[PDB]
Amino acid sequence: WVIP
Amino acid sequence: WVIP
Amino acid sequence: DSCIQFTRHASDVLLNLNRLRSRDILTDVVIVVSREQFRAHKTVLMACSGLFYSIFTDQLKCNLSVINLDPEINPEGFCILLDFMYTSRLNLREGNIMAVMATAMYLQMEHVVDTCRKFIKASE
Amino acid sequence: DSCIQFTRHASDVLLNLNRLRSRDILTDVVIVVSREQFRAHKTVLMACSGLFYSIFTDQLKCNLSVINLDPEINPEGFCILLDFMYTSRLNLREGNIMAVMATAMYLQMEHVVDTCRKFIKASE
Ligand SMILES: O=C1Cc2cc(Nc3nc(Cl)ncc3Br)ccc2N1
Ligand SMILES: O=C1Cc2cc(Nc3nc(Cl)ncc3Br)ccc2N1
Ligand SMILES: [Cl-]
Ligand SMILES: [Cl-]
């Protein structure tokens, strides 16, 4: 999971 | 396009 | 093999499937969550959820145009997860995390369940 | 928004759609290319090809279970492109590049046409  |  | 690969292809496909969803093109099922209705593509639901995969591979349920979820399922939690299926983006907030995690467990969406458990553990 | 994103989601969705294709699950159209037949999901074809997008948004053709391609289309070129749609991998070889490029132009698959033109320009 990432900060888009 | 890339070499997978 | 000696194939070449187009890096953005999978993302571009999903973006187009979401565009079809937004314009209600070739949607083939209604998911009923209490008083709310959500139109979707059976194939996308199966590709994202262990529960929908099991439902639409059943010889009788594969032909249903309406699927009713358990009454305990929250429509907002479902909506957030349906958006995630078509976009890869999850709108996880303090106010919705419990409903989202419960819905992802029911839908059998393992990666969503995992991030919810980690975000909850960080706040305790 | 304040969304989080699961990097591998789009690739995982496409991998599952290809698994449904391999087991012939929920395929809803046959593409006829001369003596060959190819089963597929209308939504995936539309998401990958400007030609299929135009075909399945037509109020009459959207309901067809069989689509016949132009007789000039090579079945092997189509097969290579159908595989690319479901996997992001393109099996481009000296022996098939002309047929693949011609098929991608007909199908309106701009990124495939672009790499074919570049590979052809490098060999001249
Ligand atoms: O957390 C998750 C997400 C998910 C998706 C599917 N979908 C499919 N799985 C397989 Cl093996 N083949 C085709 C399809 Br469509 C099955 C289980 C799960 N569990
Ligand atoms: O080279 C390409 C690939 C492609 C795909 C689509 N598909 C869609 N396009 C739009 Cl804008 N919305 C929904 C869908 Br499905 C249209 C044109 C093209 N040209
Ligand atoms: Cl997931
Ligand atoms: Cl393309």
Side-chain angles (χ1 to χ4, degrees), chain A, chain B, chain C residues 1-58 60-109 111-120 122-124, chain D residues 1-58 60-109 111-120 122-124:
Chain A
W1 294 87
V2 299
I3 302 302
Chain B
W1 294 87
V2 299
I3 302 302
Chain C
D1 219 297
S2 59
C3 288
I4 59 177
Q5 163 151 5
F6 190 70
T7 307
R8 296 292 294 159
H9 181 73
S11 180
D12 287 355
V13 165
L14 192 66
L15 183 63
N16 282 337
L17 294 174
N18 195 33
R19 285 168 173 160
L20 293 182
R21 182 174 66 121
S22 72
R23 303 170 60 210
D24 196 36
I25 296 164
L26 286 188
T27 53
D28 50 10
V29 72
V30 178
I31 307 302
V32 180
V33 192
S34 311
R35 284 190 189 269
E36 301 259 289
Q37 293 190 1
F38 300 90
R39 295 208 50 98
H41 299 99
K42 285 175 186 178
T43 58
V44 175
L45 299 178
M46 296 165 82
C48 298
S49 157
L51 185 69
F52 289 124
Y53 173 64
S54 290
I55 294 168
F56 301 121
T57 55
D58 174 83
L60 281 176
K61 301 186 191 70
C62 67
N63 293 138
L64 297 175
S65 58
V66 179
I67 301 296
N68 304 303
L69 303 194
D70 188 290
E72 206 85 63
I73 302 306
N74 177 252
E76 189 192 29
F78 186 76
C79 187
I80 288 161
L81 291 174
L82 185 63
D83 283 345
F84 168 74
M85 292 185 193
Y86 280 85
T87 68
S88 313
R89 298 159 61 90
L90 185 70
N91 181 27
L92 200 58
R93 301 177 65 84
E94 185 184 44
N96 70 27
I97 187 150
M98 299 312 291
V100 168
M101 187 170 74
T103 314
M105 288 169 68
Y106 170 74
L107 295 180
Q108 300 165 31
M109 298 174 72
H111 296 301
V112 174
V113 177
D114 184 59
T115 197
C116 286
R117 275 204 285 255
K118 290 180 186 209
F119 276 47
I120 292 159
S123 275
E124 77 188 25
Chain D
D1 219 297
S2 59
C3 288
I4 59 177
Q5 163 151 5
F6 190 70
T7 307
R8 296 292 294 159
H9 181 73
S11 180
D12 287 355
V13 165
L14 192 66
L15 183 63
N16 282 337
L17 294 174
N18 195 33
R19 285 168 173 160
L20 293 182
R21 182 174 66 121
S22 72
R23 303 170 60 210
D24 196 37
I25 296 164
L26 286 188
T27 53
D28 50 10
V29 72
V30 178
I31 307 302
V32 180
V33 192
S34 311
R35 284 190 189 269
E36 301 259 289
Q37 293 190 1
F38 300 90
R39 295 208 50 98
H41 299 99
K42 285 175 186 178
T43 58
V44 175
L45 299 178
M46 296 165 82
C48 298
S49 157
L51 185 69
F52 289 124
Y53 173 64
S54 290
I55 294 168
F56 301 121
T57 55
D58 174 83
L60 280 176
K61 301 186 191 70
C62 67
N63 293 138
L64 297 175
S65 58
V66 179
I67 301 296
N68 304 303
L69 303 194
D70 188 290
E72 206 85 63
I73 302 306
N74 177 252
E76 189 192 29
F78 186 76
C79 187
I80 288 161
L81 291 174
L82 185 63
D83 283 345
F84 168 74
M85 292 185 193
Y86 280 85
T87 68
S88 313
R89 298 159 61 90
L90 185 70
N91 181 27
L92 200 58
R93 301 177 65 84
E94 185 184 44
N96 70 27
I97 187 150
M98 299 312 291
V100 168
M101 187 170 74
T103 314
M105 288 169 68
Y106 170 74
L107 295 180
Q108 300 165 31
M109 298 174 72
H111 296 301
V112 174
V113 177
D114 184 59
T115 197
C116 286
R117 275 204 285 255
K118 290 180 186 209
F119 276 47
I120 292 159
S123 275
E124 77 188 25

